[PDB]
Structure formats: C-alpha cells, structure tokens
Write a protein that holds these residues in place. Structure first.
Motif, PDB file in Angstrom:
ATOM      1  N   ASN B 493       0.867  -1.234  -0.006  1.00 22.90           N
ATOM      2  CA  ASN B 493       0.152   0.090  -0.066  1.00 22.90           C
ATOM      3  C   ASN B 493       0.766   1.275   0.177  1.00 22.90           C
ATOM      4  OD1 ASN B 493      -1.614  -1.970   2.344  1.00 22.90           O
ATOM      5  ND2 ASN B 493      -3.030  -1.245   0.500  1.00 22.90           N
ATOM      6  N   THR B 497      -2.962   6.767   1.845  1.00 20.88           N
ATOM      7  CA  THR B 497      -3.828   6.508   0.803  1.00 20.88           C
ATOM      8  C   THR B 497      -4.883   5.383   1.487  1.00 20.88           C
ATOM      9  OG1 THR B 497      -2.589   4.426   0.190  1.00 20.88           O
ATOM     10  CG2 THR B 497      -2.062   6.743  -1.075  1.00 20.88           C
ATOM     11  N   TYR B 504      -8.970   4.920   4.668  1.00 23.27           N
ATOM     12  CA  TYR B 504      -8.127   5.815   4.492  1.00 23.27           C
ATOM     13  C   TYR B 504      -7.308   5.695   6.089  1.00 23.27           C
ATOM     14  CZ  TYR B 504      -5.339   9.997   4.750  1.00 23.27           C
ATOM     15  OH  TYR B 504      -4.678  11.081   4.892  1.00 23.27           O
TER      16      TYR B 504
ATOM     17  N   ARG D  80      -1.329  16.018  -6.153  1.00 21.82           N
ATOM     18  CA  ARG D  80      -1.208  14.775  -5.498  1.00 21.82           C
ATOM     19  C   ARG D  80      -1.601  14.800  -4.030  1.00 21.82           C
ATOM     20  NH1 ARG D  80       3.426  11.031  -6.106  1.00 21.82           N
ATOM     21  NH2 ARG D  80       4.134  10.309  -4.093  1.00 21.82           N
ATOM     22  N   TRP D  81      -2.049  13.623  -3.265  1.00 23.94           N
ATOM     23  CA  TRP D  81      -2.510  13.531  -2.048  1.00 23.94           C
ATOM     24  C   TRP D  81      -1.425  13.392  -1.227  1.00 23.94           C
ATOM     25  CZ3 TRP D  81      -6.662  15.364   0.842  1.00 23.94           C
ATOM     26  CH2 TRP D  81      -6.695  14.974   2.117  1.00 23.94           C
ATOM     27  N   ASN D  82      -0.782  12.105  -1.220  1.00 23.98           N
ATOM     28  CA  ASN D  82       0.262  11.531  -0.469  1.00 23.98           C
ATOM     29  C   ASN D  82       1.694  12.375  -0.781  1.00 23.98           C
ATOM     30  OD1 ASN D  82      -0.070  10.454  -3.093  1.00 23.98           O
ATOM     31  ND2 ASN D  82       1.597   9.186  -2.771  1.00 23.98           N
TER      32      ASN D  82
END
Lengths: 519, 519, 184, 122, 29
Positions: B493, B497, B504, D80-82
């Motif tokens: 993973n 995320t 989440y 982008r989130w991460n």
C-alpha cells in the motif's frame, strides 16, 4: 572613501565626551592579522579519550573577527569612576565602527633570516554579519578583545564554532558554514570600512545598591492590624494543652510581620573560604560542584543565577562557582594560586537576593496532629514565584557588556547571567581575512587545488564609538554616600598605570554599585 | 442567502492556495446530526463507587457542535510536507465558516422496516458562541472533528460540560446553562449559515530544530578570560593539603566554561522502554506516574511541560506520560498493545530542554569544612529561573491546533501543553440542533410537557477556510538539510492512501521540525 | 580567486597524435599560450543547500541572463637565483582579456573538461590552457585545416587597477524537466 | 556536478538538439573568455638582431573572478494527495558531514545529485 | 441559471448547421 598609497584613510580618535545625560566614548587600537589555518577550513572535534561531558564537534575557519565586548575597551578607569559615582543607571544607544590604514606585508624566510616587505596590491576581505546568519560566538567571555590600554597592539582572534555532536561524531542535523559564501568588501591599502548600528531598547543597568532590606520595610513605630499565630499551647495545671493564640506584630517581633513580597530565586552553591585551612582536604572541585544536566552531559553552572556572595561579617567566604573571577596581570592559564586571581563580590544585592551558599527557606512536609509533630525541610532550589523581586548581577570595568539572546520559543528575564545587556539583535559580528595569494604555479595545467601561497599578514587601525544614555540620581539622602576612590598612601606603583617595564595592569575589579536607593 | 427547495445553497470548496507568505486552506465535509438525549437536558455525574480522583458532575445537552481543531482537517499530507520542508514558522490569520445544503429527514420504524422521507418544513438551529459565555469544551483533544479524508462522512458529536462537584454531588456554586437561552438562527432546507473570524496575534510556531546545543556556544579555539576553581587540594610531602587553584576554561575542559543561559524547566517523568523485556514486571502505570494534586484529587500529568523524550542513542525509551500517543487505524479503545499505537518523539528540543526522564541537575546541600565533605543532591523538579530558555512542544499533522487560555488572574507562557496556539479569544464554538417536532397530540388539553416526537435527523455540508501566515527560512547553511520524504521502496500500500477496502489511514505521525536554525 | 601561469613559453605550437597511435586516436591541432575561464558546471553556482531548494520545489528551470567580472589583477615576477625563488610585484605589466562574442574561434567548452571554477568558494584554481583540433589525415593535416592566431582579435589590456566586465542574455530554451513521471 | 550547456554545431540539420551529456543546447552559448599574460622581454642585446625574442621575464598573474546568473523557475502545481519523494540528508551519526570539509581541509561531494524528485502525470 | 422544481433548466438542442467554411454540430442525450 578611497585614495592612493600615500594617503591616510583615517585619523586616530580616542576620548570621551560628557554632555548632559549622554556620554560618547570612542577608542582606537592597532591590530595585526595573521593567516589562520593556512587558508583552509578544518573540521575539529574532541579527543577520542575525552570524557562524555567534554565532547564536541565543529569547524575552524581561516577568518578572524573583531571583538569589543568588554567595558574597559571603551572606558578609562577615570571615566569609569565618573560613571559609577554619579549615575543610577546607563545603557548603550548607538555604535560606530571603522577600519582604516590597512597595510599588507609579505614575509620571506630565506636562510633563517626573515625579510618583510610591503605588498601594495594584496587585499583583505571584511564583512559584517548584519542578519545573524552565522553562529554567534561573541558573548562567551573569550580573550582577544581590544586591549584596555590604548597603546597596546593586539592580535585578531580566529573564528570557529561548534555544532551538534554525538560523542566525537556529528549528526545529520549539524550544519557547516562557508564564510566565503557571504558578500564581503575587499580593501587594498587606501580603502577603509565603516558601518553604524543602533541598540534596541533595554532597561538601564542598576548602578545602585538598595539602602533598605526586603524584610525591613515597615514602620517600626506602629503595629500591624493583622494577627499571626504566636503560641500553639498554653500551660494547664502542672502541664500544657494545645491552644492557639494570636498576636499583632510590632517591632519586638519584627520577624513575624506580614509582608507583600518575597526574595528572588535560588540555586544553592557550595561555600569555600579564602583562608586555606578552613576548606576540606579533598578534591571536590567537580564532585561538589553544582551543575545542570543536558542531553546526558553535565555542565558546570558558572556563575549561575545572581545570588549574594556571602552574608555580613563573612567576606572570607564565596560560592564555589557563583562569582566572576578575573586574573591578575601575567597570571598563568592552569592551576594558579588564589593570590593570582581577583575574586568579585556580589554582596550589594543581599537586600533582595538570597545568599548563594544557604537555603532559600524552609517548608513543612507533613500534617501535624495530636500524635504527630510538625516537620519542616530546607529548600535548596526555588524557582520563581509570583511576588518575587530580585537584582541582576553587577557589571565590571573588565567584564562583558552584552550577549545575544538565543532565538527560542520561550525565555524568562533574558539578562545574561554573566552580567550585561541581553539583546535580540546584538552588535553584529565583524569578520576579516587576508585574501590568499598563490605562489609560483606550474607551467603545465593541473586540476588539483593550490597548496602553495605567499606568506603574508596584515595590520591597521580600528576604531569604535559608542553613545551611552545616563540616568542621573535624584536622591534626598542627607548623609554622604560611598564613592569609589583611590587610596592616598604612598606606594611603589600607581594603580591602573604602567610599571617600570611598560606593563599596564588593573589591580582590582570595579563594580558599579556605589550610590544608594530606597527599596 | 435563501431560496427554494430545488436550489443548492452552496458549492464544494476544497483545496489549498500558496501565494508568497500566505497559504489558504479550505476544506468541505458532509455531516450527519442525530437527535441527542431525546431532546432533553440531563444531569450526569460519576458513578457512586468511583474513586475520589474520578468524581465529576455536569450536564449533557441535546445539542451538537462542529469541531475542526486538528491540523489534518485542513492540510493534506502533501500540503503538510510543503509547509514543513520550506518554512521556519507559521500561524493562523483569519477564518471563514459556512453551513449549507441542509436536509432534514424523518424516520418511520413500522414493523422492523425503516422508511426514511424528506421533511421539507422542519428546521435546524445554529448559533456561534461569539462571546465565550458557554463552557469551552474544544481544546481537550476529543474525537469528532472533521475527518482527515475529504470523502468521509462524519457524525456531529454531542455537547456536554462539567461544573463544580463535591464527590458525586454538586455545590451551590455550580452553574447550569440552557443553550436555548441564546439567539440562534433557524434554517430550513434552502437556508445557509456563515460567519467570519480573525485570529489575535500569536507567535509563529517554531518549525525548526536548533543546529547548536545550549552548552556548546563558545569559540572552541580561544580560551576564556574568566577563571574557575579547578583543584581544591595539592600534594604535600607524601600527603595532600587544602589549596585552591584556578584555571581558564578552553576546549579541553569545555564543561567548565562560564555561560550566560540555562536550560528550560523540568518535571521528572518515569522512563519505559519499547522493548518489553526491559521494563519491570509490575503494575506501575498509576503508582509510578507523575501527577498533580488539586483539591484533594490526583490527576495524571499528561503530557506535561515540554522536555526531550530521550538522550542520544536511546530511541527505545520514552517518558511514561510525557509524549503524545496516536492510535493506528482501527485500533481499539482499551488496553491495546504497543503495536497498535504511534508514539511521538520530541528529541529535536534536547538542545535546550532537559531530558524528561533525568534530573535537571545537582545542587549542594551542606557547608564543607575541615571535617565535613561537600554533598550534593539531584533536582527532580525545577521551576523557571531568570536566564532560562526553552522550546515548546511540536505540533503534528493529526494533533490539535489551538486551545483557549483560561480566564485567570495570572498565567505564565500560555502555550497549551499539548501543543499549538494559546488564544484568549479562540474560534468560537458552533452549536447545532434539530428543532423538535411533536407527534400527534391529544384532543383534550393537558398541561404536561410533550414527550412524543417525530423521529428525525439532519444532514448537510460544512466548509471551513483558514488563512495562514508563513515565515520563510533564510539560512546560510552550506550542506543540505533534512527533509520529510516518502520511501521509494516497493510496498503493498502507499502511505496516506486508501487500502483495497476503502479505508484511509495515516501510517505515522509527522512533526514540523526538519529545517535547522542557529541557537 | 584564480592563478594564471605562462603557457607554452609564449608560443603557439602545432600538436598531433603519436606516430604509433591507432587510427582511432589520431588528431592534429594547435596549443596556444592563452588561458580561458570556464563555469559550465552546476556546482560552480549552486551550493548543495541551494541545489536542494531547487530540486525539491520546482518542476523546471532555465538560465536567463549572465554577468561576468574580472578584477583585482596582480602580476608577479619570479626569480630563480640559486635554487631560491623570489617573487615580487610587477606593477607595470599587464594581462590581455577578450570575449569571443562572435563565435569565431573553435568552441572547446561543452566537452566536460576539468578546470572549471571549484565547487567550494574557498579554493584557488589554475586557469586551463586553450587548444583546439582541426581536420587531420592520420597524423598529418590537410589543406582544409585552419589555424587561428588569438592575437588577431581586439583584446583589452589590464594593469593592476583595471577590471573587465560583460553581460550576456540566454536565448529561449525549454525548461529542464525536474520531475519524474508518476505514470507509465 | 554535471555540465550546464553545450553549443549546438552549426550545421544544415539537427534533431532535438539537447546535448547528450545533459543540459541546454544553445546556438549562441555564453562566449569563451580568453586571457593571457603579456610577454615582457628580458635584457636585449645592444647590437641589433632581426631574430625574434626568446628570453622573457618569468612571471604569472592572479586575481578574482565573479559570475552571476539569473534562473527562471517553474513552480509545481500538483494535486497529489500523498507526500512526495524529496532529497534529504541522513540523520544518523557519522565521522564527517556530507558536502563539508574533512579534518585536513579537503572539500568533497559524497554522491551525485540529480533533479527528478517531484512527480507529474504523463 | 437557477429556478424552482417545476422549471426546466434547459432545452433539447440537436442538429447541424452548415455555413460557408464552418459546420456547427450540437447533440443532446
């Protein structure tokens, strides 16, 4: 300002001007600057076998720096006397710095015979760290300041700093600074360098002693209207019984009066005597010392929070590590006898601050009852409490002036513990270096960096002018005060003068607290 | 703004904008609000058999409240990385709040089958406690804030408070608040609610770590001009005699140098190890805990004053109750193993703050003499002293943001101990409630209050926008710095995320202190 | 800070590959008594910390304009009497400088040669010698090969006390892609 | 520590003229800067000779050089989130700090550093 | 554009228009 070879780039300014509530001191010295580290930066660290308390990691640079962070760099003994005998307080206002009459000289060591010659085209680099981006090494009471006597020539000290360390090694967080990565001004003989600086607002230094004690502020003629517990038992038939009794405090029992304030904080130190026979016959210089523990290391608390050196009738005693200690003229570096040093005394503040070698007080530890007696214990360390008042450590003619307040989230009463003014933006550091001049290169290209340079050094004059704001005394005291004075009796040498060999010496440390003030 | 049934009363705003020294974060979530307490106020109190330390008295209201007092309600992980890798400090400036797209729905539970329908005429009440007249329950690290992931739907938490208690009972001084005694705005589907707020001035949060240690600030190349007591006895003929000797501190004895500052205050905690075998085989979670005593009750000090979690080479240890501990995703509530929680670490502040599990230092306890040796003792708790400097606890992506400073006569350095910004006028509380709708009444009058209502709840969207002021770094450091980064290696993973089931999760806590700064 | 020797003892010299070299290694050209300045490496301009700032926060970058300056010239004469070296100032001697702003000389930058400015600002470096290659037939030259005399250019002569500056504007170029693709 | 630019050869044709060692291809790159010490002849003969001079005074020169370059940046605008990958120093202890001098004064670069850390959609 | 429940928020447009060197195609689904 810029001109030819045969033009002086500045004049000699050295005197003091007293006008109303200001005094302007300007001083000039001549300096000499060698080539440090042979033009290299070098990583330095503690020895492998050093104890954990003495480990360090850092760098040494080829730069020098100017330092005028001692009072006797600016005040003559006579000027210092004027200041401390007539003012209740003072503080710096603004500053002017100037560097001029640069001369660079190249040395040739042929056949054990030294020949020195001018090098008219070589240069020196100067810059002031006006944004506080370098590690600030001033304010650590280091040697290398301007000499107290204006006729002395001094060597510029080398710059170096320490960063984070893990034992003898570094960590990823430790930072390295290249001083060539700053814009700096290059001077040939015939150029000069100046800048100006304005001190931020700081409280006046208290140049007085209190004429009252914190525990003696009442009217000795009138009793209080409050009561205190004066007796806890009363006589019965041939015995006693528990019985609370109360009284109003007067002059006969002055120790029991209700009061509004408390003495300053405390951090107890060990007591030693100037008479050798009074002290224990052992080595307690480190075991018996008071220290703080930071990141697994122990560090001596020196001089620590401001506390009185001794109580009355006990001048022979002083805290082990609680006073500034200056050395007499020409005293050695390591393990000198007590006759070679000058130990300061902070007795003027025993009206508000506790004595450094006693407990702060006593507090109860249990709950008394019919079958349990009350018990108390001494308080050897006391943090600040609401209602405390205290004085700061005095400053001395040969002591430091200012210190940079560390850039942190929090701090309390940020006056430096060695004495002086705490500044968030202190006078900036002034770095200086001789520009390297390579020797005869090879006629075939080589990518290796140069390693052979012309041996040379530089010299010149430096001047610094400071304006100080005065706070005049306004006392209604009737009897005369205590003043600093010279003794009249005959002697072989006059104090604060040169001897028959030309050596200037300061015979004693001089504080600031002679005038008095009510509490 | 107001319109019909078929008009959206707002749009979805969720992103961040970086412009110069500002960053504006806006986030939107969807919420659901049940009917709490069946429309009643209820007195609540501790159980009769509870220990004295756990007694309480208070009320629970039928109101809910909105809470966005965690950083991850506003910053995405990528935005948090931008912030902490390029700025020395930040602070909130102003705030915008909006409530829109309200839908009220009535539930019918006929025959175990649930039917849900719109109720177009019912309403919800909203008001902001802009004068701080209600007990402020934000800032206690409670659950129920906006979810970190924008796609999650969350339930609004219920409002309740505690007042003075005497055991399980109340006293005359305890106060009761009816929230219907406030002016509130009533919204039908088609109305919205907005307000604005301006933060008061607060210091920037320090997003840096110090690259120097408090005990290492000197120039390692130049000795001091001050002396310290280096030896207390000297060898005589086959023996020793008491004899004081003094030395100037250099690099070889760096632990003895005179210094201007002191480390921050301390309140010692017990040390535990992440390796199970290192800890004692007993139950010392309460007996060995550090606590404070208030009105006859003991309360755990958690996390307490900011102190370093451990010294170097000791990551396995941490103070028993001195660090924030977050739980991993889906970890339980009670008695979970250490693999289910994420323990923070405050090691970046060990340059100024003492380690939480060691003593502050040592002070002398007696007066040495010819027949008495010097004795010292450890200091396990040290209040603030003049000359101390320290750092505050770090903030985390999933930690709190602000806390209301209690309205008292005095307070010292009012930064909340769990980390964040202390505000005298924090963002006000936002209360919300479904208006009760009575069921079918009787056709003959009855003075008893109603007890049968239509079962219903409400849902809608909420948005909050905050402007933050940045403080850009201005370092002259040469070597690269430490930055927060993702690992490159393969994994099942990706961090921060969703998994294959749609959950989440945040795999680790993220502080703010990566860039460096000189002390 | 730089140091410049006297190359080739003030002469131009024809150079060529060795007689026994393989055919792949044959060359013909000249070596001049001139040096040249080179700053065609990134670490001549960016510190490691500055490089980190750049690559962690930007998707692309490109140069825009340039300023060059030469100053504080010192010429020194060497005397080698009796194995002992004596170095002295020569205040009247001069150095010649010129920029090939019309690209008329063979361009030897851009071949990843040593001799650029050092990455660490405290280092002193030697100026590299200029030389070039032209057409060759084995170890010999051909009629088409060209010879350039650098004294055939207008150049500025500097004594100690003169300086030399010029400016330059980069043409339009695409940004360098400082990113990696997150898709295949 | 790699090159910056390269001069595009003056030819009839070329395709995607970015230099293969990396960097910016320029038709008019920064010009070459040539420098030389002017020869100073030694003591000449007192009777005329037409041969060219061969004896000069041995000398060299030194000085300072400065170069200033302006660079245009292109800021990232990712959604982008991460978090992303960043270049960082290691925190662990070591005998020397990277990109610093050693105990003898030698500056060294311990590894090559590229530019591609942030990400972008294709 | 915004209105009540009983108002169409748009019409059905689907055809093509040929004019000189342009052609405009609109479709609705």
């Amino acid at each position: 300002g810029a001109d030819g070879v045969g033009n002086s780039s500045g004049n000699w300014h050295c005197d003091s001007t007293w006008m109303g509530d200001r005094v302007i001191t300007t001083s000039t010295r001549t300096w000499a600057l060698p080539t440090y580290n042979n033009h290299l930066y070098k990583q330095i660290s503690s020895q492998s076998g050093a104890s954990n308390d003495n480990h360090y990691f850092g760098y040494s640079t080829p730069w020098g720096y100017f330092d005028f962070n001692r009072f006797h760099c600016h005040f003559s003994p006579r000027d210092w006397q004027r200041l401390i005998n007539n003012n209740w307080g003072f503080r710096p206002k603004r500053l002017n710095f100037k560097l001029f009459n640069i001369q660079v000289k190249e040395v040739t060591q042929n056949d054990g015979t030294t020949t020195i010659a001018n090098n008219l085209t070589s240069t020196v680099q100067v810059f002031t760290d006006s944004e506080y981006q370098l590690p600030y090494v001033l304010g650590s009471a280091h040697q290398g300041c301007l000499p107290p006597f204006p006729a002395d020539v001094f060597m510029v000290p080398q710059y170096g700093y320490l960063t984070l360390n893990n034992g003898s090694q570094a960590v990823g967080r430790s930072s390295f600074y290249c001083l060539e990565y700053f814009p700096s001004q290059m001077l040939r003989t015939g150029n000069n360098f100046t800048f100006s600086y304005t001190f931020e607002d700081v409280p006046f230094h208290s140049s007085y002693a209190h004429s009252q004690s914190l525990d003696r502020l009442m009217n000795p003629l009138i009793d209080q209207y409050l009561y205190y517990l004066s007796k806890t038992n009363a006589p019965s038939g041939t015995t006693t019984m528990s019985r609370l009794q109360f009284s109003q405090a007067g002059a006969s029992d002055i120790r029991d009066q209700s009061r509004n304030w408390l003495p300053g904080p405390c951090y107890r130190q060990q007591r030693v005597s100037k008479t050798a026979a009074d002290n224990n016959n052992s080595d307690y210089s480190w075991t018996g010392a008071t220290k703080y523990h930071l990141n697994g290391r122990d560090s001596l608390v020196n001089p620590g929070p401001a506390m009185a050196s001794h109580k009355d009738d006990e001048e022979k005693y002083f805290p082990q590590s609680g006073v500034l200690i200056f050395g007499k003229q020409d005293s050695g570096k390591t393990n000198v006898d007590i006759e070679k040093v000058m130990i300061t005394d902070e007795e003027e503040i025993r009206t508000t601050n506790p004595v450094a070698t006693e407990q702060y007080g006593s507090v109860s530890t249990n709950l008394q009852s019919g079958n349990t007696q009350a018990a108390t214990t001494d308080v050897n360390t006391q943090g600040v409490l609401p209602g405390m008042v205290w004085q700061d450590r005095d400053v001395y003619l040969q002591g430091p002036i200012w210190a940079k307040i560390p850039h942190t989230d929090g701090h309390f009463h940020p006056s430096p513990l060695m004495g002086g003014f705490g500044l968030k933006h202190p006078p900036p550091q002034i770095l200086i270096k001789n520009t390297p001049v390579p020797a005869n290169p090879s006629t075939t290209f080589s990518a290796a960096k140069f390693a052979s340079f012309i041996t040379q050094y530089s010299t010149g004059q430096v001047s610094v002018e400071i304006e100080w704001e005065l706070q005049k005394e306004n006392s209604k005291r009737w009897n005369p005060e205590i003043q600093y004075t010279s003794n009249y009796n005959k002697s072989v040498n006059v104090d604060f003068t040169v001897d028959t060999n030309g050596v200037y010496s300061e015979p004693r440390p001089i504080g600031t607290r002679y005038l008095t003030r009510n509490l």
